[PDB]
Amino acid sequence: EARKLLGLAYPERRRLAAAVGFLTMSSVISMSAPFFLGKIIDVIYTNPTVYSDNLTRLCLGLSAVFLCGAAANAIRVYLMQTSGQRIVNRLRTSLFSSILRQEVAFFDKTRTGELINRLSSDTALLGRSVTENLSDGLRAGAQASVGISMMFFVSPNLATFVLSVVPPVSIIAVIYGRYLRKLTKVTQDSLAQATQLAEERIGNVRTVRAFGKEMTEIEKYASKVDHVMQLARKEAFARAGFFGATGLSGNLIVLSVLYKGGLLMGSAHMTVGELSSFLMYAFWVGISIGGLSSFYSELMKGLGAGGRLWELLEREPKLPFNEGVILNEKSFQGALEFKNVHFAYPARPEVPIFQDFSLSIPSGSVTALVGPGKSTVLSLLLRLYDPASGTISLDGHDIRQLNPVWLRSKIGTVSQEPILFSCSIAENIAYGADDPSSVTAEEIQRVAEVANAVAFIRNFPQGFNTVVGEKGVLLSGGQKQRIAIARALLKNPKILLLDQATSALDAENEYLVQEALDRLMDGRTVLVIAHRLSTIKNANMVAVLDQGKITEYGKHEELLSKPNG
């Protein structure tokens, strides 16, 4: 905890030291200002002598001290703010890397709102409570120490009087401040309860009107708001008492401090300037107390934010993200098998997902699953989740030992409703390739021509640089699926995993989709998951899944003449 907070400021060792030096300089040459003002006043009022040549020099000299204080304050502010920024940036980048490196299963139990809030709000608190708050704390502490210590040096007898009435009175103020707060909380609770009755009923005007009971709601609300009104009166009385007592006490305390200082004769006589210095120091101490209180509150909030931020950066990923082996050397075309895998979602272990599999995929096949949960094979083949009780083999060797990046690069998937990123079409297509920057302009046009997407990609109102997304230029479903079809062609997937929408679409544009969605059967091992009979009659195997198991694993001819039907 506290040991790790020192680590954050370790990159900034030289910047922060200068800030503390300039802070202490400013405090020193700012708490010796009341002392000189007393001398200046005594030059002209306690005994005027015969005060025009011994006054210009003093003011002219003190102006220089004021200038130095201003410069020191400026430099301190600049250094502290820059250090805060340069710590917050590092925290933000490291937190984003740690979050993005984690496994998929973590995002199921954690909402995006919490992660975004940690990414923006809490980092500001953790970067401000280690540099831009300790300066204020140190300044407040120095102010209080120098103020109280030097207040005894001017008049000890009057300093023991100001520490016998101010302390006990301020104790009552803290006690009296909680009564008003609890009364206000009570009134606010009653108002919230009354409002919760007026939001439900407006939400159900249809049912409150069928029976004809509408006025009765008006009297119920009237009674509730009257009850809220009566409790609010008891708050006003206490507030009036507080205001009167606080004004009277302050005025009488100042008058009593002033009055006593004129009756001290002989032993400790107070010239005009010394009284002014005394009063200034009292004010300074009064400010410093509130400074300390604010510092403590801010420090506690900062520790609260740090408690949550100090966790994601130190969490081990559940499954390996790198450090694998790539066999390559060709001799690999979609030859994968299953060994009766059993697993449910890690998010929900209640209902089973896959209880049995005996499915095999050969080279140059258009094998097609069918049934009624069958879409989760997509998740398994790309190594996002992990089998619980089973084994997936790819050309003898299993997919566990392989490096996930190369495996996910070779396997390419196409769906019906694809997520579209907020960028130009000239980039989204390049997103498939290994290097999105190293793409020629004509390659995008050629790929659009292959997928027949030039009808809209070239002819935008903003051209190729159109921002595509849910906002602004809304692309149609057919076009936004044709762009996805064109996306995967650049990475040359040896295994293609299509998908079928249950809801039908317009047949006017169906020719282009039928020329890209299932016309990509260019010798690639394809596991089409569809329901149309055309794919069933235009493929090798039509294996059927039902009740979490594989029943039929024959070609189309064998399954064509079912024993029952």
Residue numbers in the entry: 156 to 205, 207 to 528, 532 to 724
What did the paper state?
ABCB10, a member of ABC transporter superfamily that locates in the inner membrane of mitochondria, plays crucial roles in hemoglobin synthesis, antioxidative stress and stabilization of the iron transporter mitoferrin-1. Recently, it was found that ABCB10 is a mitochondrial biliverdin exporter. Each monomer contains two parts, the transmembrane domains (TMDs) and the nucleotide binding domains (NBDs). Here we report the cryo-EM structures of ABCB10 in apo (ABCB10-apo) and biliverdin-bound form (ABCB10-BV) at 3.67 Å and 2.85 Å resolution, respectively.
